[PDB]
Amino acid sequence: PNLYPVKLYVYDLSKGLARRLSPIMLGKQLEGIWHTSIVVHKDEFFFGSSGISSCTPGGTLLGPPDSVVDVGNTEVTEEIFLEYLSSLGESLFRGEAYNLFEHNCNTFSNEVAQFLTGRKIPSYITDLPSEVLSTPFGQALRPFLDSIQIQPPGGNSV
Template sequence: MDEDGTYPVKLYIYDLSRGMARQLSPLMLGKQLDGIWHTAVVVHGKEFFFVGEGINSCPPGGTPLGEPDSVVDMGFTEVSAELFMEYLTSLAESTYGADKYKLFEHNCNTFSSEVAQFLTGKKIPSYITDLPSEVLSTPFGQALRPLLDSIVINPGGSNITGQR
């Protein structure tokens, strides 16, 4: 906590393709993608993210993905750790339960944007949230959609509600 009673909020951004999207996307999709983004919100000393098993947390940079490719300073929040955990629990019981994950429509980036907006009033950068529609706007993306819809991203961490 800072002197003024606020807590810093960061967005951790990971490229799940480890640079492959940048190299292969022009060939496969006919357009340049800079990465396949996984995001997490870091606040109150933990990294929070949404995966196929629900909302998870870990120490910052503590998933098998390692350190993030980039970090965006989202500003500060006055939301206490206790209130934030109540908020996350309510999300886990409603819109971000394990059965709600959808790779294109309802994923880690949807979660990060909603949580960042709750904490700071700001959404995450649009180049991240617009990626699924960019991929699906291509013939190759449409052809791959059935396969891609079956993929569940899970970089590890502990489920915040203890449900598996």
């Protein structure tokens, strides 16, 4: 069977700022504000307030990823993958469903990784929202944080 490498592009939206300012804001040590995407079949795929989008790898306003993580290989072909993403985009991943804490770019990548390789992405990435929420900081800014939508420019709808 033809095998296609699957990568998880990792971006620290805070560019290291969350690393030092996290103890002074949340009183807890966070290593970054993780934004991830799935790179497969030569293209980068992510979910934001605009829904599922794609771009050439490292092609958003965010620039090159801070880390490229190997997820595994998948047998899912390009045409089957696009059909899969299309199906998600019309059901559980419309732009309206975006939520900073429970339905974000990492929720997307995690579910996509599982589908393509049977593996989930690292908990330190997906658990970030709960780590922020479980603090006075997070509880006070909950209303504001729940109002936040993220959509890195540069991609086009799938």
